[PDB]
Every structure is written in C-alpha cells, then in structure tokens.
Design a protein around this ligand. Structure first.
Ligand code: CLA
Ligand code: CLA
Ligand code: CLA
Ligand code: CLA
Ligand code: CLA
Ligand code: CLA
Ligand code: CLA
Ligand code: CLA
Ligand SMILES: CCCCCCCCCCCCCCCC(=O)OC[C@H](COP(=O)(O)OC[C@@H](O)CO)OC(=O)CCCCCCCCCCCCCCC
Ligand SMILES: CC1=C(/C=C/C(C)=C/C=C/C(C)=C/C=C/C=C(C)/C=C/C=C(C)/C=C/C2=C(C)CCCC2(C)C)C(C)(C)CCC1
Ligand code: SF4
Ligand code: SF4
Lengths: 41, 152, 737, 80, 73
C-alpha cells in the first residue's frame, strides 16, 4: 500500500527505527569488546 | 614516567584495587550453592574483572598515586591510542553524517514544496545519497577548491 | 440508536498529518506547526461542533485506555510468575524481600541484581503485589500465568470493541443522554454485582486457603481451590456451618453463618492485617446496599425518579429559582462532567490513601514499611493531580460552554454577581493562616537562636494542645461496648486503645500520640490547601471578564496576555491560573508526605525485643525537633539523606544516580521559567545565518517556543525533577533501614 | 498619555481601527494607495497600550506604532 | 556512572599536562619535566641564579604554602 509506505517515512517512525538499530549495534559491539579505554591497534 | 606517573603493571595500588574488588565479589558467592545460576553469574563477573585488569596491565597505561589510569593527550607517540586515533575516527564519522545531511538538504531545495520532503523523508533518494558519504573528505576538499562550498 | 458504517477504515488519513484541523493540515511553513500538531491532538471540541461526533469519539478512546490498562496488568502478572521469588517469599514473608525484576549484564549494570533472599537476585519491588496475591489464595505460578493470558485476551477484546463501536456501529446522541439508565446500570451491575462476586470468591477460595496458610501448613500441601467446592467435607471440617448448606439463608437463620461472617475489628495477630471474614461480610453488605441503590431512577416502566423532577424542586428564599436548569447543562457539556468526576475521584484517592495505612487490609503489609510509604505517597500525588485537573476543566467549561441565553441557571448567576467578596474573604483567610501558622516556626527559631528555650511554643514552655482531636481519639477508643456493642475491638489501633501488635519482631501498629507539633503541621496543611483553593477558584471565577479586561472571554481559554497596556497584563488567562496552582499543589503534597514519613519513622515503626521494649527507627525525636525549621533541615533532611548519598558501589546505586539526575532536571527548568521568548528568537537569527553560509538552512524555518509552550515546559520539568528527587530519596532511605 | 503614529506605508485595510478596544483610531480619505485611505489617531488620550493595532498590521514592519509614555488614570485601566 | 557501578578504574582521567609544564618552567621539581628554570644548565637559570632564584626556588618547592599547588584531573 502506497499510503502505508508513506506513513513509514514520517519523521518519528523513521527516527525510532534508526535509533533502535543504532542502539542494538552499539550494545552488541560493547558486548563483544567490553571495557575499552584505549585503541590498541 | 610523564608527570611522575608509573606503569599499571608496576603499581601496587592497582593490584590492591583488583584484590579488593575480587574479595567483594567473592563474599556474595558464599550465599549460593555452586550449581545455582547466581553462582555462575558471579563466577563470570569475577573472570571478567580479572580479564579487564589484565588487559589494562597489558596496554601500557600509566597509574597515579591512587592506582587509577591516566590519559595523556599531548601527542606522544607512546600514547597515540588514547586520544589521537579515536579522535580521527570520530571526525571521519561526524564528517560523513554532516556531508550526508547537507547533500540531502541541497538535493531537495529545488522542489515546489521543499518543506514537505523534510517531515516525510524520500527514502530512495536518501538511500542513494547515504553511500556517497564514504568519500566525504575528497568531495569536501574539491568543493572547497572550486569555491562551491560557501554560499555567495 | 446506532449508525451503520459511519466512517470507512482506511490508511489515507495516516499519510496526511493534521487532518483533524483545517489550519494544521495546510503544511509546515515553520516549526510551530509540529508543536501545534501535538497540543491539539485530543481536543475533539475544536475539531468539530457536532455533539454526536464528539460523544462517539469520546466513547472509543476509553476502550483504548482499558486495553492499555489490561496490557499493564498482564505484564505485572506475567513478571511475577517468570522473574520473581514469589514461591520462596510465600514460605517466609518476614525475612525475604519481594522481587520481580531482573537485569541483563552488559555494561556492569548486573550490580543491581542484589540479594533479596530465597536464592534470588533482582530488584526489590514495593508495589505490594505479593500481599495481594497471597490474600487471594494464589499459591503456584501456573495461576499467575493463566491470569496473564486472560488479561491479554481481555486487552485484545477491548481493542476490538474500540474499533467496532467507531467504525461499524456508532451509537446515536440519544443513546448517550440516557443518564438514568446509565446510573441504574453502573450502580446495580457494575458495583453491586462486582462486590457480590468478590464476596463469593473470598468466601469460597480465600478463606480456607488463608486459614491453612495461617495454620503453618506448607503451601505445596494445601488443597487446590477447586477441591473445596467439589468436596464439601473439607469446608465442613473447616467451618461446620457449611454442612447445613444454604438452608439458614433462606429461612432467615443468618446467625449460623457467624463462623465465617464476623464483626471483630482490629488486626489479625498472625499476619498483622484485617480479618478476612470481616472483609467478606463487608463486601456482602456493600453489594446488597449497592444493589438496592440501583433501582431509584425512572426508566421505560414508569416507576422510579426523574433527575429533572428532583432537581427542579429545590429552591430557597436566598437562592431564587435554585437548581432549575442544571439538568440541561450536565447533559450537554462534556467538560463540566469531567471536572466534577475529576474532583470526586481525587478526593476519593486521598481518602483511600489515608485509610489504607491505619487499617492494613493485606497480610504482612504493615511490617513492610517501604510498600506502605510508597503506596501512601503515590496515591496522594495522584489525588492532587486529579484535583487540579478538576479546576482546569471547570475553567474550560466556563470559557467555552457558558450561555445564559439558552442555558440559564440561577445558582450560577448569583455566584458570579458577588465574586469579589468571595475572593477578598479567601485572601484574608489565606493571609491570616500564613501569618499564624508559619510565623510560629520563625518565633521558635529566633528564640532558640537567642538562647531562650523557655519562650518557645513547645510541649515544655508554651503548649498548644490539639484538644479537639484528642477528644475524638478518646471517644473512638471507647466506642466498643458502649456505642458499638457488636464490635469486639476498635476500628483502628491508632485511636489510643493501648494494645500493640508485633509481627516478626517488628511493630505493625500502635497508638499515635498528638502534641504541639501536630497542631502546627496541621495548620500548615490547612494554610497550603487554602492558598491552592484560592488560586484555582480565582482562576475559575474570573475566566470570562474582570474590571481590567472586560472582554476576556473573546480571547479564549489559553492566551498569553493582552499586551503591555494597563501597566501589564501578563498571565491573565484561566490556563495561567492552573499553571500557577500546580506549584502550590506540589508544595502542599510535599509537606504532607514529609510529615507522614517523619511521624511514622519517629513514633510508630520500630522493633520489639523479648522483654517488650520498643526501639523506633529515629528514636522518637519528632516531638522536640520538628518545632523549628532548623530541626527539619538537620534531623530530617541532613540525617536521613546519608542512605542515598552512600549507595554507590551497591545494589542501591540506581537511586543515587536518580537523585542527581532529578537534581539536574529540576534545575534545568528554571531556564524556561525565568526567561522570555524574544531573546531566544533573536539568538536563533545568528545561528541561522551561518547555516545559510554553508547551504544547510532548512526550509522549515526554526522558531522559538511560544509563551504558553515555554511555561508548560518549565512547569513540567520542575514537577518531574522535584517528584523524582523525593522518590529516589524516600526509596533509598526506606529500603536500607 | 501614550503616543501613536501612522506612517505613509499605509494600505488602508481598516484592520487597526476594528481591533481598537477603545475609540482611538479612525480612517480619513487620502491619496497615495489603491484604497485611497489612511489611518489616524485623534484620541490618543484614551490609549491604554495593549498594542492590538500592531497585531493586525499586514505591512512587513508596522505602519502604526505605539510608544508607551506618561501613565494616567485612563491609560492604566483603573476602575477604583 | 563508573563510580556508581563499583568500577572506579574505568574513569576518564586526563592529566593537565600544559599547566604542569608551565609549573615546571618556574622551577617546580614535582613532575620531572626539567625545563628552563628547572634545568640548572640553562641560560635562564644561570642569568638570575645570584639575584632572586634561590629564595623563589626555596619558596616554590615547599608544599605547605599556596604557591603553585599540585594539580590533577
Ligand atoms: C540470545 C540469542 C542471540 C544471539 C546469540 C545473538 C547474536 C548476535 N546479535 Mg543479536 N539479538 C537477539 C538475540 C541474540 N543475538 C535478540 C533477542 C534481539 C532483539 C530482537 C537481538 C538484536 C540484535 C541487533 C539489533 C543486532 C544484533 C547483532 C548480533 C550479532 C553481533 C555481532 C556482530 O555485529 O557481528 C556481525 C554479525 C555477525 C557476525 C552475524 C550476525 C551477534 C551474532 C548485531 C548484528 O548482527 O550486527 C550486524 C545487531 O546489530 N542482535
Ligand atoms: C562526551 C562524553 C563521553 C565520552 C567521551 C565517553 C567515552 C566512553 N564511554 Mg561513556 N558515557 C557518557 C559520556 C561519555 N562517554 C555518559 C554521559 C554516560 C551515561 C549515559 C556514559 C556511560 C557509559 C557506559 C555505561 C560505558 C561507557 C563507556 C565508554 C568508553 C567506550 C568503550 C567502547 O568500546 O565504546 C569510552 C571511553 C564504556 C566503557 O567501557 O568505559 C570504559 C561503558 O561500558 N560510557
Ligand atoms: C506493559 C508493561 C510492561 C513493561 C514495562 C515490561 C518491561 C519489561 N519486560 Mg515485559 N512483558 C509484558 C509487559 C511489560 N514488560 C507483557 C504483557 C508480556 C507478555 C505476557 C511480557 C513478556 C516479557 C518477557 C518474556 C520478557 C520481558 C522482559 C522485560 C524487561 C526487558 C524489556 C526488554 O528488553 O524489551 C525490549 C523491547 C522489545 C520491543 C524487545 C522489562 C523490564 C524480559 C526480561 O525481563 O528478561 C530478563 C523478558 O525476557 N517481558
Ligand atoms: C456471586 C457469588 C457467589 C457464587 C457464584 C456462589 C456459588 C456457589 N455457592 Mg455460594 N455464597 C456466596 C456467594 C456466591 N456463591 C456468599 C456471599 C455466601 C455467604 C452467604 C455464600 C454461601 C454459601 C454456602 C453456605 C454454600 C454456598 C454454595 C455454593 C455452590 C452451590 C450453589 C456454588 C458454587 C454451597 C456449596 O459449597 O456447595 C458445594 C454451600 O453450601 N455458598
Ligand atoms: C480523565 C482525565 C483527563 C482527560 C480525559 C483530559 C482531557 C483533556 N484535557 Mg486535561 N487535564 C487533566 C485530566 C484529563 N484531561 C488533569 C488531571 C490536568 C491537570 C494536570 C489536566 C490539565 C489540562 C490542561 C492544562 C489542558 C487540558 C486539555 C485537555 C483536552 C485536550 C487534551 C490534549 O490535547 O492533550 C494533549 C496531550 C499531550 C500533549 C500529552 C502531554 C505529555 C505529558 C504532559 C508529558 C509526559 C512526560 C513523560 C513522562 C515523558 C516521556 C516522553 C517520551 C516521548 C520520551 C482534553 C479534552 C487542554 C484543553 O482543553 O485545551 C483547550 C489544556 O489546555 N488538560
Ligand atoms: C453518633 C455517633 C454514632 C455512630 C457513628 C454510630 C454507629 C454505629 N452504631 Mg451506634 N450508638 C450511638 C451513636 C453512634 N453509633 C449512641 C449514642 C448509642 C446509644 C448509647 C448507640 C447505640 C448503638 C447500639 C445499641 C448498636 C449500635 C450499632 C452501631 C453500628 C451499626 C448501626 C447501624 O444501623 O448499622 C454503627 C457502627 C450496632 C452495632 O453494634 O453494630 C455492629 C448496635 O447494635 N449503636
Ligand atoms: C545535517 C544537518 C546539520 C548540519 C550540517 C549542521 C551544521 C552546523 N551546525 Mg547545526 N543543527 C542541526 C543540523 C545541522 N547543523 C539541527 C537539526 C539542530 C537543532 C538541534 C542544530 C542546532 C545547532 C546549534 C544550536 C548550533 C549549530 C551550529 C552548527 C555549525 C557548527 C558545527 C557544529 O558541529 O555545530 C554543532 C551542531 C549541532 C549541535 C547539531 C546537533 C546534531 C544534529 C542533531 C544532527 C541532525 C542531522 C539531521 C537529522 C540530518 C538528517 C539527514 C537525513 C535526512 C539523511 C555547523 C555549520 C552552531 C553554530 O555555529 O551556529 C550557527 C550552533 O551554535 N547547530
Ligand atoms: C574551545 C575549547 C577549549 C577551551 C576553551 C579550553 C580551555 C582551556 N584548556 Mg583545554 N583542551 C581542549 C579544548 C579547550 N580547552 C581540547 C579539545 C583538548 C584536548 C586536546 C584540551 C586539552 C587541554 C589540556 C591537556 C590542558 C588544557 C588546559 C586548558 C586551560 C588553560 C589554557 C590552555 O592550555 O589552553 C589549551 C587550549 C587548547 C588545547 C586549544 C584547543 C582548541 C581547539 C580549537 C579544539 C579543537 C579540537 C581538535 C579538533 C582536536 C584534534 C585532535 C585530533 C587530531 C585527534 C583553559 C581553561 C590546561 C589546564 O589548565 O588544565 C587544568 C591543560 O593542562 N586543555
Ligand atoms: C451563613 C451560614 C451558612 C450558609 C447558610 O445559611 O446556608 C443556607 C443558606 C440559605 O439557602 P436557601 O435555603 O436559600 O437555598 C438552599 C438551596 O439548596 C436551594 O437550591 O445559604 C445562603 O443563603 C447562601 C450562603 C452562602 C455562603 C455564606 C457564607 C458561608
Ligand atoms: C483477576 C483478573 C482476571 C480474572 C477475573 C475473573 C476470573 C473474574 C471472575 C468473575 C466471576 C466468575 C463473576 C461471577 C458472577 C456471578 C454473579 C454476579 C451471579 C449472580 C447471581 C444472582 C444475583 C442471583 C440471585 C438470586 C436471587 C436474588 C433470588 C433467586 C435465586 C438467585 C440465586 C437466582 C483477568 C483474567 C480478567 C485479568 C485481570 C485480573
Ligand atoms: S495601520 Fe496597518 S492595519 Fe491600519 S490601514 Fe495601515 S497597514 Fe492597514
Ligand atoms: S495600543 Fe491599544 S488602545 Fe492604543 S491605539 Fe493600539 S489598540 Fe488602541
């Protein structure tokens, strides 16, 4: 549906999806590599 | 020994802090059976604490009189990993984000009602623009050289 | 009286924000459009002028509210079955702290999974759900899972009903205005039948299971609830009167049911709560009374009363025509009904908060101090907010729906013709109470500082005894045997009977003395309440006109000002009066909760020893230290905040973080309250200039927040910060000790 | 009394005189615009200063300006 | 937040390197930078070593007064 796809492009829904994916990625990254203080490579 | 600091691996206060944390963690373990899940969680926490302290010891950080690591940001090559490299990574990412935003704003400026494309995002156009920001430094530098970057 | 398919179900309106308004749907020229979209979301009266459509819209949203509440209940019941130590707590309620929340270990937050007993690690909860589940006869987790499933099903049903009664069959206006039938149904069926069903459940399930539990039997060896129904021998063994069946009820031999329907009064020594037989008898009597009350108003069968007929018959030589015309106002305006209901609900919530603490209805609730404190403060805050909303919507009705041409009422007309006297008298009362209540505190502080303790208002130098309240306490302590022959003990242990109940080595309840400090704090409460009432009533009464702005009704209910003329006209609308009264409501509720907390910690709660000596938490320092402001600052704020500021490194560090977070939020609100819009609009102009330089200027022109929006943001952040600070402090203090 | 001034950027749409809560402003004939009208302020002694006239001006910057000045019993809206 | 969870070693603590260097340039020997007036072989130290440097160095290297206090993160 075109009208359903239009509602998914509104600012709050897109922001929520983007930030949820971002937070998931950051949480997983910190889970894999915990307690990082310096860049060792 | 910059500013009278000492390495983490040679500091006694660092080991004292590690021992105190481990002893505090082990006290709560005696309240639970060894097979119980909280015992497994506490064992994992103790192992993580030991691993974190060993990793801090391995990376060549500097400890103060309180047994805490300190960060040198003056540009010494021996400590380029504390401030310099993450700073460059952050600058690259922030430039990517800013360039993508500016490109999207410029692209829709010629439309009849540009304010409508800001609250309802044109997803295909943004997606086509997103990948372009991976080479943002070159585009920004060449735009500056041609005099296009600054509005007249 | 329904309409078939009024509105088509489609996604078309989803893609066009602001469809409910003509102006908002035009498009976002500036950023004010986004803010205006949310502020007018639920103002159905502004969208359309048809009463039927507004009623239809109002009817559907309540279904969504009920569905949300059912989802919340489902989550609460499910978490107690999967992530809780309810079964372990059931075998030792006095030594195990209830917990129903666990945390994932990611960034070191697993320290919050503190030890609570029963071999469990989690966050200690203070909502009192464990006591409710125990009082209902719940033993295993399967029952909780079934309850969660049922709540989920009910939420789905409520959502479907909400969709149906708006998109498939919407009732007509004549259906909504049947107030007599609605009152009859909500009295006879919603309340009376519910009370009867709960009485039946308590009689058949809660009583035997709770008796078995109080006997000390292992919860896993107690027969299941259905075994007491199929096997009447078990109930007959527990209660011999059950062997006779329902014959005594139908022969009016009700005296046989005295074994499980009593009039004891007081508290159960084993658990520290009210007797469950008393609760069952109370619910039965209340069900009968509500069933009788639901047959008063007239319907299709002639017999009954007409509300209009009742109203039109009351008038006096001072009031003129009286209550004639009030029936038409209350059956045509949604705002007046909302205001009245909000006021009544807030008052009822405050009454419930006051009644729950002194008459513990759940087992092992009096000795759980954190739960008691949390429930008291929560219900008081809810009641205050509802009370403020009542006045807000009364002002809204006064501004919008008032029309003497077609909805004239004599009582409303007479009130508006002498508002000056009411306001002036209330002002004088507020000033007098403030002078003669707070002034006594400054006198005590000055005399103490100067070194003259003998010239203070205290129990040792100049007594101000609350002789009237002590007389009530004495009368209620002597009520059984004289004025209540059927009672065995008094209604509450706080009246001054002299008996003390101790459960698990802790003091549950005991008589509460009243002295000079209670006099001062009660008059402080009265002063604050009177000031809040003054502010709200002044806002409501002058909503349409005044001597300063004769045409205030034309400007609307929510407008910022009328210019710098007449010396200044800042905050003259009725909205600003609610904005100002919220602060005073916050002040009064904070003072009340501080009084409650200190008094209970100093004079009631404590521990008892083998010889029977009581050692309170703070050692009974309320009488001599609360008579000065320095005492409140030192012995209450400074002394009791050491628990929250020393919570770092333990399972209570979340409260320590929330303390500073709420400090920051409260301090952040003063930027919006102390400043104005022009400065921020002028500052934005410079920021926009550099964006134009780099071709990053948006087409949605940035605009500073409006005056009303700024005031709302300031008051919201202020209230949030203050309440969060008090919440963190209270929980951190009371959980540790 | 406050001071009210009119500038020749007027377009004569009569919006200021209709929003006046007292009788201060009025319209007079003029030449210089399409409407052939211009506002006037003959009764500034009744001005209260609420600045409703400036809220109704459609010109980019106001063709009617109110400058607050010495306060009297009329300009303060007192009915004691 | 690092202190709340019981791991004080995760803090971001940054030494004030430039101010300590300036302090060492005035003759303070508590950081081991050895620059200018802290270096006994520099022209600056040799120029004023017979007029005011002894008293100033005695006063600056005594840790009970408020002259150029030690600094940290
Ligand atoms: C309990 C089982 C479980 C397991 C083993 C994982 C494992 C993983 N998840 Mg994950 N996740 C789970 C449950 C689980 N998740 C749940 C219940 C949710 C919520 C619905 C998520 C939401 C989630 C998000 C939002 C993201 C992950 C990501 C990841 C990957 C992180 C490594 C990475 O980025 O490398 C690269 C990935 C791989 C090598 C394989 C994938 C890793 C394979 C991240 C990921 O895949 O990054 C692309 C990521 O962004 N997960
Ligand atoms: C500009 C401020 C600032 C900066 C520079 C950092 C920087 C950092 N934070 Mg951090 N943090 C901040 C504000 C900031 N934080 C705030 C305001 C909070 C509270 C919400 C946190 C809460 C937080 C947590 C909970 C954790 C970090 C962690 C870290 C480290 C990241 C390690 C990694 O792999 O990623 C990094 C040094 C991680 C770490 O290991 O730190 C050593 C980590 O677990 N931060
Ligand atoms: C509406 C009230 C409410 C609230 C505030 C919570 C809150 C919570 N639930 Mg939850 N839950 C609810 C209703 C609720 N639930 C209902 C109605 C059900 C179904 C009966 C569940 C079933 C459920 C499960 C099965 C789990 C939680 C978990 C959690 C916790 C982690 C949330 C998370 O990671 O989600 C992230 C958000 C997503 C959308 C995913 C969190 C405290 C988790 C937990 O505590 O694990 C330790 C967990 O495993 N919940
Ligand atoms: C709406 C509530 C309700 C419901 C559904 C029931 C239902 C029932 N009651 Mg009952 N009961 C109730 C309220 C209720 N009672 C109240 C308020 C009292 C107190 C007067 C009783 C006193 C009572 C007695 C004394 C007995 C029942 C019995 C019964 C059962 C056989 C009829 C039936 C399951 C009988 C039973 O247990 O038979 C199996 C029985 O002997 N009830
Ligand atoms: C049964 C309760 C009830 C009901 C049905 C209503 C219904 C209504 N009220 Mg109302 N009100 C109530 C109680 C109630 N009120 C109470 C108790 C108060 C006193 C505090 C008020 C004070 C009040 C005012 C002052 C006004 C109304 C108005 C209105 C009308 C428009 C509502 C609207 O647009 O809000 C839109 C709703 C919102 C914008 C949501 C507000 C968001 C809250 C405040 C912040 C929550 C913070 C949260 C925890 C943070 C998370 C954020 C998240 C995104 C991360 C509507 C008829 C308005 C009106 O009639 O104007 C003509 C109006 O001006 N009410
Ligand atoms: C004015 C205060 C007052 C109040 C609030 C009450 C209240 C009550 N009285 Mg009561 N009573 C009072 C004065 C009062 N009495 C006086 C002055 C006398 C004469 C000395 C009595 C003599 C009296 C008797 C004899 C009985 C009650 C009973 C009751 C209870 C039930 C009454 C009913 O109809 O149901 C109720 C709690 C009844 C009771 O015990 O209910 C359990 C009962 O049998 N009262
Ligand atoms: C991509 C959009 C964009 C770009 C390129 C800039 C660029 C700039 N801003 Mg800025 N700003 C933006 C959005 C943007 N802003 C938004 C949305 C806000 C409102 C929150 C602000 C608020 C703001 C203030 C208050 C100030 C600046 C300032 C500045 C200048 C100093 C550099 C800097 O880091 O400032 C700091 C930049 C920020 C703090 C902005 C926060 C980051 C935002 C949230 C990113 C959002 C991007 C957006 C979602 C794009 C979506 C792209 C998508 C459609 C593909 C610089 C020219 C400063 C200046 O020199 O004054 C002119 C200044 O004082 N900005
Ligand atoms: C505009 C921001 C700003 C301001 C006002 C100050 C102000 C101050 N700093 Mg300072 N500082 C800053 C940014 C800033 N700093 C940054 C970003 C760093 C990290 C490199 C430092 C590191 C730092 C140290 C180590 C010390 C100070 C100290 C001081 C104080 C003494 C004056 C001085 O030495 O100047 C210092 C001035 C600068 C370093 C100039 C920075 C301004 C540029 C424009 C910021 C741009 C950041 C840049 C993009 C990073 C690129 C790195 C990348 C290659 C990885 C003074 C209050 C001293 C003090 O008294 O502490 C107690 C001290 O010892 N600063
Ligand atoms: C004064 C005594 C209390 C009041 C009293 O006597 O109440 C009763 C008195 C007379 O009432 P009426 O009998 O005239 O009308 C009663 C109404 O219910 C008729 O709709 O009320 C007034 O005259 C107004 C009082 C306003 C408030 C006055 C200050 C308090
Ligand atoms: C908790 C919960 C839940 C559940 C609930 C339930 C389960 C309920 C039930 C309920 C019920 C189950 C009810 C019932 C009722 C009944 C009734 C109400 C009846 C009545 C009857 C009558 C009234 C009668 C009468 C009579 C007479 C008078 C005469 C003749 C004889 C007779 C007997 C007929 C859920 C899941 C939702 C979720 C949330 C929470
Ligand atoms: S003063 Fe303003 S409103 Fe009045 S005629 Fe001139 S432009 Fe129009
Ligand atoms: S400031 Fe007010 S009173 Fe004065 S002319 Fe304008 S509208 Fe009339």
């Amino acid at each position: 549906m075109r009208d359903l796809k239009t509602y998914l492009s509104v600012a709050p829904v897109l922001s929520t999806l983007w930030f949820g994916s971002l937070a998931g990625l950051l949480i997983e990254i910190n889970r894999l590599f915990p307690d990082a203080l310096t860049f060792p490579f | 020994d910059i500013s009278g600091l000492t390495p983490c691996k040679d500091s006694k206060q660092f080991a004292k802090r590690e021992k105190q944390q481990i002893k505090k963690l082990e006290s709560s373990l005696k309240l639970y059976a060894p097979e119980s899940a909280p015992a497994l969680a506490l064992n994992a926490q103790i192992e993580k604490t030991k691993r974190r302290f060993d990793n801090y010891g391995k990376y060549g950080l500097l400890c103060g009189s309180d047994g805490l690591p300190h960060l040198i940001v003056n540009g010494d090559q021996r400590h380029w990993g504390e401030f310099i490299t993450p700073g460059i990574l952050f600058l690259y990412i922030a430039g990517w984000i800013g360039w993508v935003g500016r490109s999207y704003l410029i692209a829709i400026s010629g439309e009849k009602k540009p304010a409508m494309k800001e609250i309802i995002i044109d997803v295909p156009l943004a997606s086509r623009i997103i990948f372009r920001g991976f080479i943002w430094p070159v585009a920004a530098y060449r735009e500056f050289l041609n005099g296009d970057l600054i509005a007249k | 009286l329904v309409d078939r398919d009024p509105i088509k179900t489609s996604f078309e309106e989803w893609a066009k924000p602001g469809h409910f308004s003509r102006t908002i749907a035009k498009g976002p020229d500036t950023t004010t459009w986004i803010w205006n979209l949310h502020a007018d979301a639920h103002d159905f009266d502004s969208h359309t002028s048809d009463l039927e459509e507004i009623s239809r819209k109002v009817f559907s949203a309540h279904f969504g509210q009920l569905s949300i509440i059912f989802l919340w209940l489902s989550g609460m019941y499910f978490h107690g079955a999967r992530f809780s130590n309810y079964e372990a707590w059931l075998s030792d309620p006095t030594h195990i702290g209830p917990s129903a929340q666990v945390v994932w270990p990611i960034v070191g937050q697993e320290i919050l999974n503190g030890d609570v007993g029963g071999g469990f690690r989690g966050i200690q909860i203070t909502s009192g759900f464990f006591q409710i589940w125990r009082a209902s006869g719940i033993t295993s987790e399967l029952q909780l899972y079934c309850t969660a499933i049922g709540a989920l099903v009910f939420a789905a049903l409520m959502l479907f009903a909400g969709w149906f009664h708006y998109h498939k069959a919407a009732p007509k206006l004549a259906w909504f205005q049947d107030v007599e039938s609605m009152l009859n149904h909500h009295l006879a069926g919603l309340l009376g039948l519910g009370s009867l069903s709960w009485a039946g459940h308590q009689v058949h399930v809660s009583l035997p299971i709770n008796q078995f539990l109080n006997a000390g039997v292992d919860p896993k060896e107690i027969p299941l609830p259905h075994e007491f129904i199929l096997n009447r021998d078990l109930l007959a063994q527990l209660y011999p009167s059950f062997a006779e069946g329902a014959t005594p009820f139908f022969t009016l031999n009700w005296s046989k049911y005295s074994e499980f329907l009593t009039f004891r009064g007081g508290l159960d020594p084993v658990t520290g709560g009210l007797w469950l037989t008393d609760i069952a008898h109370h619910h039965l009597a209340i069900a009968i009374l509500f069933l009788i009350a639901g047959h008063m108003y007239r319907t299709n069968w002639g017999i009954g009363h007409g509300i209009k007929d009742i109203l039109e018959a009351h008038k006096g030589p001072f009031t003129g025509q009286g209550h004639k015309g009030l029936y038409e106002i209350l059956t045509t305006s949604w705002h007046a009904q909302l205001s009245l209901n909000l006021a009544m609900l807030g008052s009822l919530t405050i009454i419930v908060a006051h009644h729950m603490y002194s008459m513990p209805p759940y087992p092992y609730l009096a000795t759980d101090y954190a739960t008691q404190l949390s429930l008291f403060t929560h219900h008081m805050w809810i009641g205050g907010f509802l009370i403020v909303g009542a006045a807000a919507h009364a002002a809204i009705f006064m501004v919008r729906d008032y029309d003497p041409t077609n909805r004239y009422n004599d009582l409303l007309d007479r009130v508006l013709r002498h508002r000056d006297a009411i306001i002036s008298h209330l002002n004088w009362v507020c000033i007098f109470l403030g002078f003669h209540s707070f002034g006594l505190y400054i006198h005590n502080d000055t005399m103490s500082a100067l070194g003259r303790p003998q010239d203070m208002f205290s129990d040792t130098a100049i007594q101000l005894q609350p002789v009237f309240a002590q007389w009530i306490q004495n009368t209620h302590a002597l009520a059984p045997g004289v004025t209540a022959p059927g009672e065995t003990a008094s209604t509450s242990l706080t009246w001054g009977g002299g008996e003390l109940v101790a459960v698990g080595g802790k003091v549950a309840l005991l008589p509460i003395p009243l002295g000079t400090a209670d006099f001062l704090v009660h008059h402080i409460h009265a002063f604050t309440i009177h000031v809040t009432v003054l502010i709200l009533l002044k806002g409501v009464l002058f909503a349409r006109s005044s001597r300063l702005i004769p045409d205030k009704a034309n400007l609307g209910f929510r407008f910022p000002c009328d210019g710098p003329g007449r010396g200044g006209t800042c905050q003259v609308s009725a909205w600003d009066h609610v904005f100002l009264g919220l602060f005073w409501m916050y002040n009064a509720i904070s003072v009340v909760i501080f009084h409650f907390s200190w008094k209970m910690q100093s004079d009631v709660w404590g521990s008892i020893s083998d010889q029977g000596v009581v050692t309170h938490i703070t050692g009974g320092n309320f009488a001599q230290s609360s008579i000065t402001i320095n005492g409140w600052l030192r012995d209450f704020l400074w002394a009791q905040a050491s628990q929250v500021i020393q919570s770092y490194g333990s399972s209570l560090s979340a409260y320590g973080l929330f303390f500073l977070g709420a400090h920051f939020v409260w301090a952040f609100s003063l930027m919006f309250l102390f400043s104005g819009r022009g400065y921020w609009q002028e500052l934005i102009e410079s920021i926009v200039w550099a964006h134009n330089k780099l071709k990053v200027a948006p087409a949605t022109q940035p605009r500073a927040l409006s005056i009303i929006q700024g005031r709302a943001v300031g008051v919201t952040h202020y209230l949030l910060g203050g309440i969060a600070t008090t919440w963190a402090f209270f929980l951190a203090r009371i959980i540790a000790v | 009394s406050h001071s009210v001034k009119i500038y020749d950027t007027c377009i004569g749409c009569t919006q200021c005189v209709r929003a006046c809560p007292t009788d201060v402003l009025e319209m007079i004939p003029w030449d210089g615009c399409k409407a052939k009208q211009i506002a006037s302020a003959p009764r500034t002694e009744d001005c209260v200063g609420c600045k409703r006239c400036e809220s109704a001006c459609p010109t980019d910057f106001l063709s009617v300006r109110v400058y607050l000045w010495h306060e009297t019993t009329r300009s303060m809206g007192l009915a004691y | 937040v690092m202190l709340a969870f019981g791991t004080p070693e995760k803090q971001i603590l940054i030494e004030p390197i430039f101010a300590q260097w300036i302090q060492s340039a005035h003759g303070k020997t508590s950081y081991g930078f050895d620059v200018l007036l802290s270096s006994t072989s520099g022209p600056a130290f040799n120029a004023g070593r017979s007029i005011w440097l002894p008293g100033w160095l005695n006063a600056i290297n005594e840790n009970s007064n408020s002259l150029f206090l030690t600094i940290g993160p």
